[PDB]
Ligand binder design. Sequence first.
Ligand SMILES: O=C(O)CC[C@@H]1CCCN(c2ncnc3[nH]c4cc(F)ccc4c23)C1
Length: 167
Amino acid sequence: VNSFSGYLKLTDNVYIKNADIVEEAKKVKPTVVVNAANVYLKHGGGVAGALNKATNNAMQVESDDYIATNGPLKVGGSCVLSGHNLAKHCLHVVGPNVNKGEDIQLLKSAYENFNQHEVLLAPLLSAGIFGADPIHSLRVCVDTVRTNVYLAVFDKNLYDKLVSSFL
Ligand SMILES: O=C(O)CC[C@@H]1CCCN(c2ncnc3[nH]c4cc(F)ccc4c23)C1
């Protein structure tokens, strides 16, 4: 038993809710919140900009030190950093950005990072400003992640579409 509430169950291990991931993180304090990161951990907009704003820019400060030490992430890769006031940990995961021409097949590699964590609160990778089809992203999530994932979908119209079209 865990503290996530109001989710619709899609599969044995995948759950979905119309929610603002920032507010969901603030209430649940999950062990892991996933950020829709880029390779530079520049949290300017989308989910990343919202998560970072909610940390009063502490996420960005920590991220800049990470990059200065380690260099950029790989597309499809991840790193674990602090969850600040939102979660114990933040798993920064880089899905391919279609608006940069990155290979959508890397989306599966991106979701594989979730399997290193037993339970996660997450957005749909490569959705939103990353330019992928959120329905495809949901399919890859379901077919790749084996651990327990609670997906927050900010847009109510999109949430309803994802549910109604789910196979
Ligand atoms: O850009 C991509 O391709 C993938 C990232 C997606 C796209 C944008 C919507 N989305 C979210 N998902 C869950 N909660 C959210 N709160 C938010 C608050 C904001 F100010 C902006 C986005 C979100 C958001 C993240």
